[PDB]
């Protein structure tokens, strides 16, 4: 019996940012969804399209996992058909999404005194993103009508920091979100549930 390595995704020491997220591929193993209550029993699951009861007796080909860190007031934007600054410029989900969204509070891990400026997010962009798209450009945004040369009036930097602190409110605390996508292709399904 070969189990899928969920400890490499749920028990990581350092996570990534929302503008540059990681995507792992899981295949040829058994998906045991009972070890998730050891990282944190309080796992806020949110399934769109499939039920957790009928998810145990299904077989898929590839399972993708995405991880990032956002605030507490931005968890609602991780859903099909949402509008904001994270869903439009950082990470967008399609209207026909079939998966689950898991999040938990990590205040006692990603928070220090004098500010934690190791997390960034994009706020300024020209257009919107497409479903499952990634952008890591660091060019100066032009808001006026003059050519941008350096940095100054009407020329801003597209990245901004969070700076978490343990004294912040429950809405301004860091949260770790994990997205699980299920894909079925014309290939033998090597990812089934326990029997």
């Amino acid at each position: 019996t070969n189990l899928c390595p969920f400890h490499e995704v749920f028990n990581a020491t350092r996570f990534a940012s929302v503008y540059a997220w990681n995507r792992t591929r899981i295949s040829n193993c058994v998906a045991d969804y009972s070890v998730l209550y050891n990282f944190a029993p309080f796992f806020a699951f949110k399934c769109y399209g499939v039920s957790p009861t009928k998810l145990n007796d299904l077989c898929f080909t590839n399972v993708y996992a995405d991880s990032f860190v956002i605030k507490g007031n931005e968890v609602s934007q991780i859903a099909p058909g949402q509008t904001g600054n994270i869903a439009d410029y950082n990470y967008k989900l399609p209207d026909d999404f079939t998966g689950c969204v898991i999040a938990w509070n990590s205040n006692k891990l990603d928070s220090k005194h004098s500010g934690n400026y190791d997390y960034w997010y994009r706020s300024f962009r020209k257009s919107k993103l497409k479903p499952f798209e990634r952008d890591i450009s660091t060019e100066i945004y032009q808001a006026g009508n003059k050519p941008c040369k350096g940095k100054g009036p009407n020329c801003y930097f597209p990245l901004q920091s969070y700076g978490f602190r343990p004294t912040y409110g429950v809405g301004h605390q860091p949260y770790r979100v994990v997205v699980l996508s299920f894909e079925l292709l014309h290939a033998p399904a090597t990812v089934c549930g326990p029997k």
Partner: protein, 597 residues
Amino acid sequence: STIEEQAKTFLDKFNHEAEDLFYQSSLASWNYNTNITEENVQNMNNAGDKWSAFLKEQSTLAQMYPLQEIQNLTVKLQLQALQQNGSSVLSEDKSKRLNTILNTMSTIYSTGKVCNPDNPQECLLLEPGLNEIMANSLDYNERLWAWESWRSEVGKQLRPLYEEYVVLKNEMARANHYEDYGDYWRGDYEVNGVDGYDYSRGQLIEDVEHTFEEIKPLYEHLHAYVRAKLMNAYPSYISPIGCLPAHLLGDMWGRFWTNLYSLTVPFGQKPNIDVTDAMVDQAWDAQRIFKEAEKFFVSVGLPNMTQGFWENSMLTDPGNVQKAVCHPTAWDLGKGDFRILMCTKVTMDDFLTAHHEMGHIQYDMAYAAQPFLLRNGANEGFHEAVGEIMSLSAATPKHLKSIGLLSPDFQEDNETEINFLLKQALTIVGTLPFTYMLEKWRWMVFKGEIPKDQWMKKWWEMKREIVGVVEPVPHDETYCDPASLFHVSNDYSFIRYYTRTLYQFQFQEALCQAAKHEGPLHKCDISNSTEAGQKLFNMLRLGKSEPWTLALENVVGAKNMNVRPLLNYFEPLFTWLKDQNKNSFVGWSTDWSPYAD
């Protein structure tokens, strides 16, 4: 691209850093106010300097966006708030001189001591000082000395400093496209842009005078009633048709007449309502008081407090190893952080002040979703009014009987109601004429109608004309008695108290009518009512994005301030005072003076 998108981007970029910097400054200020050390002072000064430098560098950059090309009201208000130059229009030498004068006046007021004439080594302070003398004393000469020494020692070293301060402030106001400092102060009550809700800086004085013309008779009757008992208090001193001495009003300046309740009690044989003994017998504490306040605030349909509030607030005195300031203040730091600093004792006054502080906290939590530049009240006298409308409801006999502090065998009679109404009146009505006269005198001084050689003359004339108080000793133009007050020497305003006094009664009447109350107004209680809670939350969530006229119409259905609620509240006391003064003289003459004999 147009100007609106650039302005929006600039505002977002500004707020993103302004929130963090303001949070750091507030945290430093809290750490200073909790523990008094030198490192805390250094950190607070550094944070304040950084915040001031940020506010300076963020200015002069929003000048690229003219207000004549913006059609959105919110962005226009934010830009207008950001484009204020301030004191930077003056030269550096004048600014340094003004800061030096301000610090000198603050140090002179904060450092004062009155020494004994017969013993120069016996020098007393002010607060553990002349306050206790003016509070509890029944001697004419002692009060006269404590008044004259205080008004002659620290009343002569602030004349030229105040003159130069007035000159510099007038120059700054004229440089900032204002007529004088009075217009700069009245600019808060200004609404321009919305049809049907505009307000000018000249209608406020007219409204204040129109309200005072109707408030005057009640004050006349109250003064006539107080003078009759003052005649019996000090024989052969008070005149039956004369004014009242300034050193007998209860305190140093005569702002409140609360200390005169012991001598002007209507019925001394009836007991009073003091739940202090019951609280001591039931062994309560600060936790119980704050939990009762939270239960009261939740009973109307308001959210609960946060865990950080109970984990980070200081509700008890630390002791002697750690020094702190026991002034009750509400702290809003941002990012969902609300704290209360208060040295709570087992009394009734602290039980009433807890509700005021919790109302302040609720108001602060109401507009947490508004932008940073709009996270403030719609007007000056709104927070205090919200606190007072809760304190009045918490100070009702029905609430005390329901929470278990009063025995259910209490017999409510008419004399107890009369005593309660008189005790409330001696505190509420006694401060309106003083504030009105002081503000009018300051406005006339800033405008330039009173020459320098007539300041004290016009001051005492307006005193004897409006308030009806005559000085025991005449003073020349060498004294600066009007500057002996804290708010006068620290550059603060006074009309907020009048506005709050009106708005609290307006809101009280509105909420009691919405709660379907029957009977007198002073017995109203808004406990266990969701309609009033929703009607109040609809206004508390607006913040500063809407004019105060619309916010007042959404509550009481009116656009301006009114005085009828106060008259409806004090009607029974008015009738009783009429019945008592039917056999007495009403009015006062300005010809009599204590130094005439």
